[PDB]
Amino acid sequence: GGVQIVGQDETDDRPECPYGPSCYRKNPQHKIEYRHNTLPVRNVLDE
Ligand SMILES: Nc1ncnc2c1ncn2[C@@H]1O[C@H](CO)[C@@H](O)[C@H]1O[C@H]1O[C@H](CO)[C@@H](O)[C@H]1O
Ligand SMILES: [Zn+2]
């Protein structure tokens, strides 16, 4: 199985959709031009 958030959807070069979690639009370029979740997935320790 696997129900974790290790990547979400390849969002390393995305700015930030203004709608956010309540985004009712689903276009092909809208999921690649902006991102809906700004969670940390790379810098959480720095060693
Ligand atoms: N909750 C919510 N999410 C996304 N977009 C939303 C929205 N509430 C309203 N909008 C957009 O604003 C205008 C109002 O003038 C609506 O027509 C919505 O426009 C959406 O439609 C397109 C994609 O289907 C986009 O232009 C998006 O803005
Ligand atoms: Zn959006």
C-alpha 29 chain-centroid distance: 14
For ligand 1, whether the C-beta of 22 sits within 6 Å is yes
Count Cβ neighbours within 10 Å for each residue of 21-46 and write b for 16 or more, e otherwise. eeeeeeeeeebeebbbeeeeeeeeee
Cα 47 to middle of ligand 2, angstroms: 34
- C-alpha of residue 46 to centroid of ligand 2, in Å: 31
- The verdict on the CB of residue 19 being under 6 Å from ligand 1 is yes
CB 41 within 8 A of CB 7: yes
CA distance 31 to 42: 20
Cβ-contact 16, 38 below 8 angstroms: yes
